[PDB]
Structure 1
Amino acid sequence: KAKKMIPIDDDKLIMEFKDDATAFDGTKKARFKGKGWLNAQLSVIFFKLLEEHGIKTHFIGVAGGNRLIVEKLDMYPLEVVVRNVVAGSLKKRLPLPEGYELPEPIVELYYKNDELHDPMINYYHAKVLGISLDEIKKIEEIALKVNEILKDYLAKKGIILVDFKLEFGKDKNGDIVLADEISPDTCRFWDAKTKRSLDKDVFRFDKGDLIEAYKEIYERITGEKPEF
């Protein structure tokens, strides 16, 4: 939908970020010149920050442009959502308004399954899917640590980390490794002062120019204007 995965050997693969965007279960589509580049660069920056804080990620290197070199993993069929501020689907699960500051972070597990439209699950469903409690607990422990690091880092830069989605896999040592991407596609980012979205919500709800929003994020994080 927004990324290509190209095998290299029985060891690593290429993650290519595309300019395509989709929302509302693939029903809304557009293309954004340079979105691939931005998401790639921002993933790189985030993976490197996390690695420095002792988070095992799949990031190996950059292969020029929109391509990252990443470790091949046996992927868990999960999307792991961490939420700090009420937004999106959480409003349908808790009678709390958009912008409501949660007393502590919420972690939600979604089963990656297109036929079922990625339904929420709990630890018991996970076990039936072959994911032990020990594994789930390790997964949530990492997500919550990732949350702390990202939110602290973004707060210093005037960005509120509202919520975000992670994915994980297992390496050949049986270690749990952070995978996929971390980008304005997979996080909610709000300007600390104005509360305005600097993320995919801009595309989702026609809140303005997506590229402009993603550029702003890139500039606020790196300190420089995007080269492309």
Structure 2
Amino acid sequence: AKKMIPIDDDKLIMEFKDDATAFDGTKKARFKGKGWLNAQLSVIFFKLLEEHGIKTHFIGVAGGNRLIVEKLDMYPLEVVVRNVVAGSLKKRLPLPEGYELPEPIVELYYKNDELHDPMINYYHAKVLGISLDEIKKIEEIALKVNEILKDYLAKKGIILVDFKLEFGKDKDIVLADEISPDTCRFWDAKTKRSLDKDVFRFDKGDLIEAYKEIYERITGEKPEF
């Protein structure tokens, strides 16, 4: 759903596609507009966070579905922040779906398609080369990012249930990858319906529909091109 195209040593282009993928490829479809929407929600989000002094890889926009992003020495981590009990958190804690966590939970995953992204802790993280200090900073950034996204979305009747972040090191630790309904769980505050990729993962409705809603609610206008 994303392709990374190198420019030079400092920067590259991140290209958002219309291809949507679930369950390791076994489920696939294409949604006209998804790429544009995802790139654009990413820009909105990265700029919002950068307003609060969050350092992000975002440099500029290169057309509707392409971002220009600074080049990074990437951590082999997928970091998940959770405000509301959903998905695999059910398999880990005795709490029903939708339960509001008293504090956000940070989970670390070793980014590794083959091991199917296994959860690790600080000891595994060290083995993979990430120091305790880096870890602590990564978690602190994530929770700072969690607070800004959650408060921002909540004012617009959107629940940030959870989301995934990636990070890398500039030549300082830097937030990377994307921030889109591909990588977050959003629920309508009133209804609790998904407005994210879960709609496609579990055929609970129209995907392009739900993503346009996010876009509409944030910008206050329908999606163009």
TM-score when scaled to structure 2? 0.99
Residues of 1 paired with 2:44 and 2:64: CA distance? 14
Once the two structures are TM-superposed, the CA of residue 103 in structure 1 deviates from its matched residue by: 1.0
Residues of 2 paired with 1:167 and 1:29: CA distance? 23
Residues of 2 paired with 1:115 and 1:34: CA distance? 30
Q: What stretches of structure 2 of length at least 5 have no aligned partner?
A: none
- List per-residue Cα deviations over 1:29-63 (Å, max 9, x = no partner): 11111100000000000000000011000000000
- List per-residue Cα deviations over 1:129-150 (Å, max 9, x = no partner): 0000000000000000000000
Once the two structures are TM-superposed, the CA of residue 23 in structure 1 deviates from its matched residue by: 1.2
Provide runs of 4+ in structure 1 moved above 2 Å.
none
The DSSP-based 3-state class of the residue aligned with 2:151 is helix
Residues of 2 paired with 1:164 and 1:41: CA distance? 17
- List per-residue Cα deviations over 1:76-105 (Å, max 9, x = no partner): 000000000011111111121110111110
Residues of 2 paired with 1:126 and 1:44: CA distance? 30
Residues of 2 paired with 1:213 and 1:79: CA distance? 24
Choose 37-46 or 27-36, whichever is displaced more: 27-36
Once the two structures are TM-superposed, the CA of residue 27 in structure 1 deviates from its matched residue by: 1.9
Residues of 1 paired with 2:191 and 2:177: CA distance? 30
Residues of 2 paired with 1:219 and 1:154: CA distance? 12
1:181 is matched with 178
C-alpha RMSD of the superposition:
0.6
The DSSP-based 3-state class of the residue aligned with 1:25 is helix
Once the two structures are TM-superposed, the CA of residue 12 in structure 1 deviates from its matched residue by: 0.2
- List per-residue Cα deviations over 1:182-224 (Å, max 9, x = no partner): 0000000000111110000000111100000000000000001
Residues of 2 paired with 1:50 and 1:8: CA distance? 25
Once the two structures are TM-superposed, the CA of residue 112 in structure 1 deviates from its matched residue by: 0.5
Residues of 2 paired with 1:170 and 1:26: CA distance? 30
The DSSP-based 3-state class of the residue aligned with 1:116 is coil
Once the two structures are TM-superposed, the CA of residue 26 in structure 1 deviates from its matched residue by: 2.5
Choose 62-71 or 26-35, whichever is displaced more: 26-35
Residues of 2 paired with 1:64 and 1:25: CA distance? 29
Once the two structures are TM-superposed, the CA of residue 25 in structure 1 deviates from its matched residue by: 2.6
